[PDB]
Structure 1
Amino acid sequence: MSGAGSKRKNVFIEKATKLFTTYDKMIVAEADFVGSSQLQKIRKSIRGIGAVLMGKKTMIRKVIRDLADSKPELDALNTYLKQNTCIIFCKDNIAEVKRVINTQRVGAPAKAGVFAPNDVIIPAGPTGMEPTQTSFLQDLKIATKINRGQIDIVNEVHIIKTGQKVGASEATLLQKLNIKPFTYGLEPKIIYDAGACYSPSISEE
């Protein structure tokens, strides 16, 4: 049935329903490409002020806490149906948490099937191309045009967002080139309050 097997949820629910009523101001984050190398260097800063707490869609076991708390799992923004989340909890630093949590990011190339964050720029132009790596990009469907003396297609505007998969042939163009345009990491979605929403705005700063 439930509550069985290896790595039991009945020893996780002691953290997933009990310490989820002892906090003031929380950060709905994004764990869609975040490492454990980049996570251990942000889970030592939060450890003194709070915790990095998520049951990951075990959290509809929070419906029994909503008797007097009136805590929304679906009534707030980002209705939690298409993504992964690991929400950030704080006791001491409920206020200046948004600055070290958005510093330790690393820019890196993406792969195929990644969750495609809001700031992705395709490597293009003269500096974003070799004359030898054209024959890989010459394999694809789209025909090329000559701009600034190079077999290349230019796309520097944002075309993809969270919820659309990246094609498979686009991954090697980020991996082989040194072009890492965006420094990605944790992404705050909603600033959550104990029964309401504190800030219903996004702030990546």
Structure 2
Amino acid sequence: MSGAGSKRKNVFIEKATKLFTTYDKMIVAEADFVGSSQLQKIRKSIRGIGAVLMGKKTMIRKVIRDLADSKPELDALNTYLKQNTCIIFCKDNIAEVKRVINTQRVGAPAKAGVFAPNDVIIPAGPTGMEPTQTSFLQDLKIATKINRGQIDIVNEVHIIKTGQKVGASEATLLQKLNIKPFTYGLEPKIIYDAGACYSPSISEE
């Protein structure tokens, strides 16, 4: 084929001329690796402050929308764009913009080849019984899955916790588990006012 993704462009020309950069605060956010199903529910105060906007073909064309403002073109001698990264325009204060996305956040399920931190409890419900499942749970510390009047092969409380994070060893034991609600929020690429740039943050500073 021959095009852009796999078809020629007629709406990505409009992403540069989508708005004027009237808003004084922007931030590069990594909300693409988290899924679109959960991404639309957390964003209610996230849109109305400037919205989640702009394409990633036009992220290089973004430079003509910084010359209008007092902002320099690059953020801190680098645009910081080597990832699925989108711009979120904000009207919230200099301290509030540091935690604008993390105020309402949620993660996606853990994939093959990565563990990810699991802070929230795992779901429950009737899923039969399996004796071979107990042999795989011997690697883990808790070897008990049947709880209460119901019967099932996974617990109602998270056994996978922070501290057990690794590259690729205990990640195979999560494929034995039948459900993956791995919460680690969303990820700031950088924080930025209108001239000065900062590192990713969760606090007011």
TM-score normalised by L of structure 2 = 0.55
Structure 1 residue 124, shift from structure 2 partner: 20
168-177 or 59-68, which deviates more: 168-177
78-87 or 139-148, which deviates more: 139-148
Instruction: String of CA shifts for 1:116-146, please: whole Å, max 9, x gaps.
Output: 7999999999999998447669999999999
SS in 1 for 2:187: coil
**What is aligned with 1:75?**
75
Structure 1 residue 84, shift from structure 2 partner: 1.6
Q: CA separation of 1:94/1:107 partners in 2, compared to 1, >3 Å: closer, same or farther? A: same
Paired with 2:176 and 2:43, the residues of 1 have a C-alpha distance of: 31
Q: CA separation of 1:164/1:54 partners in 2, compared to 1, >3 Å: closer, same or farther? A: farther
1-10 or 64-73, which deviates more: 1-10
Long gaps (5+) in structure 2: none
Q: CA separation of 1:109/1:34 partners in 2, compared to 1, >3 Å: closer, same or farther? A: closer
Instruction: String of CA shifts for 1:70-116, please: whole Å, max 9, x gaps.
Output: 75565527753532212322236775466573244345541126797
Structure 1 residue 172, shift from structure 2 partner: 4.6
Paired with 2:3 and 2:192, the residues of 1 have a C-alpha distance of: 29
Paired residues of 1:107 and 1:182 also in contact (CA < 8 A):
yes
Structure 1 residue 51, shift from structure 2 partner: 0.5
Paired residues of 1:124 and 1:153 also in contact (CA < 8 A):
no
Structure 1 residue 49, shift from structure 2 partner: 2.4
SS in 2 for 1:41: helix
Q: CA separation of 1:103/1:68 partners in 2, compared to 1, >3 Å: closer, same or farther? A: closer
Equivalenced residues, count: 205
Identity of aligned residues (%): 100
170-179 or 155-164, which deviates more: 155-164
Q: CA separation of 1:46/1:191 partners in 2, compared to 1, >3 Å: closer, same or farther? A: same
TM-score normalised by L of structure 1 = 0.55
Paired residues of 2:31 and 2:186 also in contact (CA < 8 A):
yes
CA RMSD between the two structures: 7.5
Paired with 2:80 and 2:179, the residues of 1 have a C-alpha distance of: 32
124-133 or 179-188, which deviates more: 124-133
Instruction: String of CA shifts for 1:131-181, please: whole Å, max 9, x gaps.
Output: 844766999999999999999999999999999999787555224437969
Structure 1 residue 190, shift from structure 2 partner: 1.9
SS in 2 for 1:87: strand
SS in 1 for 2:136: helix
**What is aligned with 1:135?**
135
Off by >6 Å, runs of 4+ in structure 1: 1-8, 114-131, 137-169, 178-181
Q: CA separation of 1:167/1:95 partners in 2, compared to 1, >3 Å: closer, same or farther? A: closer
Paired with 1:63 and 1:50, the residues of 2 have a C-alpha distance of: 18
**What is aligned with 1:157?**
157
Paired with 2:164 and 2:64, the residues of 1 have a C-alpha distance of: 34
Q: CA separation of 1:193/1:118 partners in 2, compared to 1, >3 Å: closer, same or farther? A: farther
Structure 1 residue 2, shift from structure 2 partner: 11
Q: CA separation of 1:58/1:135 partners in 2, compared to 1, >3 Å: closer, same or farther? A: farther
Paired with 1:147 and 1:77, the residues of 2 have a C-alpha distance of: 56
Paired residues of 1:25 and 1:191 also in contact (CA < 8 A):
no
Paired with 2:81 and 2:61, the residues of 1 have a C-alpha distance of: 16
26-35 or 7-16, which deviates more: 7-16
Paired residues of 1:120 and 1:160 also in contact (CA < 8 A):
no
Paired with 2:91 and 2:7, the residues of 1 have a C-alpha distance of: 28
